[PDB]
């Protein structure tokens, strides 16, 4: 099998710990963590210019993953799309490593 | 809690 989660996947990081980690980084650095306020969701924490913002990973009954309109077969394909299409609709923010 | 896309 594959076992190992992707490098940016940190199941047990709280929203606050994700903020503290990402405030040290540039725009677009990000992590994926299991959700706190909704057990059973995942969240994506992303450095913006002045703070860290959070996105809810959406799903449908076919198992697709999405944030907005475009849908993906996997979390990895979602993350990949947001490297070159802005994950923010108010400012331009691209996921980066 | 708030999320951008919710």
Swiss-Prot record, chain A:
N6-acetyllysine occurs at which residues? 56
Subcellular location field: Nucleus; Cytoplasm; Endosome
Give all residue intervals belonging to the SH2 domain: 8-97
Family under the similarity heading: Belongs to the GRB2/sem-5/DRK family.
The name of this protein is GRB2-related adaptor protein 2
What role does it play? Interacts with SLP-76 to regulate NF-AT activation. Binds to tyrosine-phosphorylated shc.
Subunit (UniProt) = Interacts with phosphorylated LAT and LAX1 upon TCR activation. Interacts with SHB. Interacts with PTPN23. Interacts with phosphorylated LIME1 upon TCR activation.
């Amino acid at each position: 099998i594959d076992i190992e989660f992707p490098e940016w996947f940190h199941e047990g990081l709280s929203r606050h710990q994700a903020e503290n980690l990402l405030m040290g980084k540039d725009i677009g650095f990000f992590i994926i963590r299991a959700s706190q306020s909704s057990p059973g969701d995942f969240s994506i924490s992303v450095r913006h210019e002045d703070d860290v913002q959070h996105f809810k990973v959406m799903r449908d009954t076919k198992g697709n993953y999405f944030l907005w309109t475009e849908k993906f077969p996997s979390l990895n394909k979602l993350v990949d799309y947001y490297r070159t299409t802005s994950i923010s609709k108010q400012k331009q923010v691209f996921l980066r490593d | 809690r708030e999320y951008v896309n919710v």
